[PDB]
Design a protein around this ligand. Structure first.
Ligand code: DDP
Length: 264
């Protein structure tokens, strides 16, 4: 292995149950939060001075047909940076030159290593897939199908639109699910009923507002927000948020933003 190991968390769509999924998601959360530094919401490590040896978390997805895919998640934002399939590695275009320095410490042992011209942002992936998030069905099935698409990509199955769609599925069911309890539950309920459904406004709005929320909550004047934030209900209606309290059972993780509160 390359100097200093990277923690791995396994999951499989074979005997996928609400229990296994919940354990998986909570395991990811439990490893992302290196320790302290939190009102009541856990904060993610600060990229500014985070050591390479503690920069990534590996998630090994296993399919019903024994098709493994190793997804690399950035511990500072819980987002997917790239993945390994067979003897190849594919990474999303490094938005920042410093991140490139980090990426080079990932799947070093692989024969083939590639880097996409596009980034990992939904807006981009959606254009490539020609499909909005509110169209792509989520659930255990879609994830199971996503694993396969990502796998055979390294051999010829490829088909860019399919590859892009698969990423949107994985990111939401893993990254987003670990970021908000709300989204975790949405995925859990789908498994609970063996269904497949596209996320509604409530889910999308949260995802699009993750950074916004993290900032506002971390910059809350003692307890209240600077200005109220408008979210969306299931039916698409919009409501205003003023405190972090109502958000406690909704949000799980936040990305580091400013000067920490004056663990002692
Ligand atoms: N849509 C989107 N793209 C990204 O690359 C990240 N890091 C994020 O949090 N959200």
């Amino acid at each position: 292995i390359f100097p200093k190991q990277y923690p791995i968390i396994n999951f499989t769509t074979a005997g996928a149950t609400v229990q296994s999924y919940t354990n998986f998601i909570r395991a990811v959360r439990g490893r992302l939060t290196t320790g302290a530094d939190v009102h009541e919401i856990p904060v993610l490590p600060n990229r500014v001075g985070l050591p390479i040896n503690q920069r990534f978390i590996l998630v090994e997805l296993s399919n019903h047909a024994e098709l493994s895919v190793t997804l690399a998640l950035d511990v500072t934002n819980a987002y997917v940076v790239g993945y390994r399939a067979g003897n190849s590695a594919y990474f999303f275009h490094p938005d920042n030159q410093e991140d490139a320095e980090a990426i080079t410490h990932l799947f070093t042992d692989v024969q083939n290593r590639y880097t996409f011209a596009f980034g990992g942002n939904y807006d981009r992936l959606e254009q490539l897939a020609g499909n909005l998030r509110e169209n792509i069905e989520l659930g255990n099935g879609p994830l199971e199908e996503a694993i396969s698409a990502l796998y055979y990509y390294s051999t010829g199955g490829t088909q860019l639109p399919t590859l892009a769609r698969s990423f949107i599925i994985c990111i939401q069911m893993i990254s987003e699910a670990a970021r908000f309890q709300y989204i975790e539950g949405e995925m859990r309920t789908r498994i609970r009923y063996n269904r497949r459904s596209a996320p509604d406004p409530s889910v999308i709005t949260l995802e699009n507002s993750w950074g916004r929320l993290s900032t506002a909550i971390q910059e809350s004047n003692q307890g209240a927000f600077a200005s109220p934030i408008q979210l969306q209900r299931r039916n698409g209606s919009k409501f205003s948020v003023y405190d972090v309290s109502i958000l406690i059972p909704i949000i799980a993780l936040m990305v580091y933003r400013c000067a920490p509160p004056p663990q002692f």
